[PDB]
């Protein structure tokens, strides 16, 4: 189960030697140790991916596309997003 997130301090940050490590150990922060405390409760493997465009993402006015991290949850490129995702109305109707 892929935990996607965004690189914002102090939620997700790089460690001291991220080239020397791989996978989950390339990242640290608030949500990262929160991601483990979800995993110890629910029992699933995870791999942290960073959303590419660096936006939390909102619906475009004309094309009605989602970009950003909600664009990964709706369109299915990741399975869960432990990140500073602000609860709104336009984001409630597309992801829970």
């Amino acid at each position: 189960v892929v935990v996607t997130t965004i690189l914002e301090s102090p939620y997700v940050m790089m460690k001291k030697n991220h080239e020397m490590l791989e996978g989950n150990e390339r990242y640290e922060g608030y949500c990262v140790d929160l991601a483990a405390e979800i995993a110890k409760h629910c029992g699933f493997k995870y791999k942290l991916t960073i959303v590419g465009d660096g936006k939390y993402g909102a619906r475009d006015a004309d094309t009605k596309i989602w970009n950003g991290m909600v664009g990964e949850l709706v369109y299915g490129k990741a399975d869960i997003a432990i990140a500073p995702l602000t609860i709104t109305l336009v984001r409630e109707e597309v992801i829970d």
Binding site: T63, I65, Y75, G76
Partner: protein
């Protein structure tokens, strides 16, 4: 027509053969009036046709039951024309009463030469819309 009228001259009892969307209107008419039974594993007839027996099960009910399992409402539908369009009428009528946003795109008219460039123009049209889930409905040669 000639091969059916040929075997009508040999005095056969039952006729086994295939058909397509071109000749579905031929065999079901010839076997209806000449009262000769016909057995086929091709695509089944749409309305009830006399004297024509189908060995291939209908899947338009099972396709709707599969979609209502996965809880889909926004899916593209790449269909082939030459197989017939009876499945398309089922997933458009059921697109009404279950709130489905179907993007039904024909794909069967693509040639032998420029087939790779139009399919690149095809799936890019499902990237402006961002249709992830795609029902392919075509013969084995159009699947691969």
């Amino acid at each position: 027509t000639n091969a059916f009228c040929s075997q009508f001259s040999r005095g056969v009892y039952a006729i086994f053969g295939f058909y397509d969307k071109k000749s579905v209107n031929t065999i079901t008419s010839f076997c209806g009036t000449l009262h000769v039974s016909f057995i086929t594993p091709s695509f089944p007839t749409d309305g009830t046709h006399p004297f024509v027996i189908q060995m291939r099960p209908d899947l338009k009910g099972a396709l709707l039951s599969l979609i209502e399992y996965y809880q889909w409402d926004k899916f593209a539908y790449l269909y082939d024309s030459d197989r017939g369009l009876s499945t398309l009428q089922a997933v458009l009528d059921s697109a009404a009463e279950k709130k489905w946003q179907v993007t039904a795109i024909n794909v069967g008219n693509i040639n032998n030469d420029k087939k790779d460039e139009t399919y690149r123009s095809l799936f890019q049209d499902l990237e402006l819309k961002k249709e992830r889930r795609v029902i392919l409905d075509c013969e084995r040669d159009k699947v691969n």
